[PDB]
């Protein structure tokens, strides 16, 4: 189990990194395409920031 812990920890860290892409972080949406499709270049920059 001491080595399976290492393997599982690395895999879980990468999976958590993938999961964390669903946060808005204050933006109107968590998806670049939605922001770029409903907002013009003007405030899409603010949200993408």
């Amino acid at each position: 189990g001491k080595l399976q812990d290492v393997v599982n920890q690395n895999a879980q860290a990468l999976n958590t990194l993938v999961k964390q892409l669903s946060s808005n972080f204050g933006a109107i949406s968590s998806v670049l395409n939605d922001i770029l499709s409903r907002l013009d270049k003007c405030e899409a920059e603010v949200q993408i920031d």
Partner: protein
């Protein structure tokens, strides 16, 4: 590994290593009565390596981690001073080769 270490073998595991430590574990203890030294002719004898034990009547000198009794002899022990200062010293004869 637990016990006195004899030798280790390495093996590879994914992202790690496994050591098979072969060690020596003493198994069957036995009680004995002992003294730090023995008075022979007014002079104390101490083991050069080993320890004095007795099975009730006779006194032998045995190695530390294995019961291998040996007859008390001049080549098994060494002398230093008279046999009064030592605490717990006992009386016994020290054989000599002849």
């Amino acid at each position: 590994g637990k016990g006195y270490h004899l030798m280790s073998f390495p093996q590879s595991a994914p992202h790690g290593v496994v050591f098979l430590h072969v060690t020596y574990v003493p198994a069957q203890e036995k009680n004995f009565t002992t003294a730090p030294a023995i008075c022979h002719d007014g002079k104390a004898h101490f083991p050069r390596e080993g320890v004095f034990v007795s099975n009730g009547t006779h006194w032998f000198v045995t190695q530390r981690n294995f019961y291998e009794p040996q007859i008390i002899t001049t080549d098994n022990t060494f002398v230093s001073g008279n046999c009064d200062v030592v605490i717990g010293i006992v009386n016994n004869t020290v054989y000599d080769p002849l």
